[PDB]
Amino acid sequence: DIFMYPMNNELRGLWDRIENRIYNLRHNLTLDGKEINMDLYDS
Amino acid sequence: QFGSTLLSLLERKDSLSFDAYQMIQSGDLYRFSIDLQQQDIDINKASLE
């Protein structure tokens, strides 16, 4: 009885999926979490 | 003899003054040189990006 039933994966899948979107919204990112800004470079 | 002797000294002097002036004058071009070289470095950075 050393093991236990773990939390079933699809649940954390859902949790994580939403958390990822939320994070992107935290940082104004695309749904893809890609930067929306053009990230211009110069010197 | 005195007059001729002195003359030669003035010729010496102006020679040195010319060389000095020329050297310091030439020293300025490095400014531009540095500017453009650094600029090229930045350009290569952009290319890498």
Question: Brief overview, please?
Answer:
This is part of a larger assembly, with 2 copies of chain A. Chain A has one helix at about 10-25.
> What assembly state would you assign to the polypeptide chains in this entry?
part of a larger assembly
Radius of gyration of chain A: 18 Å
Q: How would you sum up the major sheet of chain A?
A: none
Helicity level of chain A, as a percent range? Answer: 40-55%
N- to C-terminal separation of chain A? 63 Å
Structural class by sheet pairing and helices of chain A: mainly alpha
Order of helices and strands of chain A: H
Number of helices of chain A: 1
Chain pair with largest interface: A-B, 3 and 4 residues
- Sheet-strand content of chain A, in percent, reads under 5%
How many strands of chain A? Answer: 0
Task: Give the CA-based shape of chain A.
Answer: elongated
Topology diagram in text:
The structure is cut from a larger assembly and holds 2 copies of chain A.
Chain A: H1 9-26
PDB class: toxin
Keywords: Toxin, pore-forming, insecticidal, chitinases
Entry title: Yersinia entomophaga holotoxin complex in prepore conformation
